[PDB]
Amino acid sequence: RNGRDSEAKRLGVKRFGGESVLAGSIIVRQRGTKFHAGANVGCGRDHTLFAKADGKVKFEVKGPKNRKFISIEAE
Template sequence: MTSILGQMLGWVGGAGRSLLPSNAQSWLTCARNASKKAGGSSRNRKGRPRGKHRGVLRRDGQYVTQGTLLVRQLGLDYLPGLNVGIGRNHTLYAMYHGRVMMTTEKVNPNWDHYIMQRFSSDLKDLNIPIYKTYFHVLTEPQETKFKLVDQV
């Protein structure tokens, strides 16, 4: 029965011969895998924007001139201190020439403000002090090498 079934299916039998159908070897040689990897995004720079270069730009003790950017930030991670201005996008900049000084100070927020109620109401209930980093620009004292010539 197996020989009749084998002949009907086209099996090749006998010693040293394969048990695959005679046309199955052509099927096996046609099956191929991909020889190249699919195109990735390693070189596709079109859709990726450049970095915004946020963060602390000037450190403690550095000398800065008027208008120098000190910090670029999204929120208010750092707060402006003495002789430091704040821009519309929360950028801190020096208003006068001088040396940068960073301090960490305790903040007493206005808990009645709607932003504090919305985002930090859970901190009010915990009664934990809030500390923030302030940026200050300390101006150099001017030299007093003048003498009074005449008084009006």
């Protein structure tokens, strides 16, 4: 009777560093803010980190508490 599990929700990083992405592309589907919003990135209501402008994707590590930020470059 013990065995049971949900359907897995397909989380994680959809687009990694070093990829030319377009606007509104979902990058990370996560639960908490394990990945933190930053430059050109919105945080969704399920903390889906979603993009705002065309360009690359750069994973910065900034902040006093050593957090993990995502950004969109231009060049």
